[PDB]
């Protein structure tokens, strides 16, 4: 398509499908979602926010990033630090599981981040936009599941505090991603590298449910 951000959506579609299959995914969408394994997603999505997060500070001024810098309105680390205190309690950075596959997720973000920036964008839209967008379904679908206390805490993560509009705001970010000026030979590579995402959220999902079926 023209648009980057209509040509992201078109070329994923695809994997996307393939995400909502996976096994893991499919428990989870059937409300089949246990606390080992929502502690689980819980931890893999702090090790992938920290990661990047790091590049996108590191990159904030290039101008093959600059465009889609929104640090208050979607950075998720601080989310996720209390989230985690909550599921593993205050010695969570002693505990919480860094597998295998997180790592592979969490090494492909600081090699775009160090290597190929351009390609950052890719990691930006596909955990940022798509968090914003069927965040709130799995979110849902989550509490409902969790049967949590009233501790008012846990899933901060699913919040964004600073952005008042969720379709206002991911207009914007389509218009500051329809901004970027790249060769058609990086764009192709951008829409690569977001296909990419999600295969590595298919083998982290494949990964976690077999840690879980013991
Ligand atoms: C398997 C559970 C998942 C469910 C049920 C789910 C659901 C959704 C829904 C309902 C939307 C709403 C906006 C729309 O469709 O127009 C969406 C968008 C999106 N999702 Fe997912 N999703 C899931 C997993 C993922 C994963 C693993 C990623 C990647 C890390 C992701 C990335 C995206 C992106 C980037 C968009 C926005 C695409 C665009 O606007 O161009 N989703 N998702």
Redesign the pocket.
Known sequence: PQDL??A???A?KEV?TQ????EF??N??KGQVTRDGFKLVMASLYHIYVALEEEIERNKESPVFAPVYFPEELHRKAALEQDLAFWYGPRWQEVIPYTPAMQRYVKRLHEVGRTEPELLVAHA??????????????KK?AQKALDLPSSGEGLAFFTFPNIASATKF?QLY?SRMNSLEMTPAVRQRVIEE?KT??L???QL?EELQELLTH
């Open positions: 951000s209509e992201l959506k078109e994923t996307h995400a909502e299959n996976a995914m499919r989870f969408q839209y596909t955990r940022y936009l798509g968090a914003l967008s069927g965040g709130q379904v799995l679908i991911k389509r977001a995402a999600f590595l959220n298919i999902f």
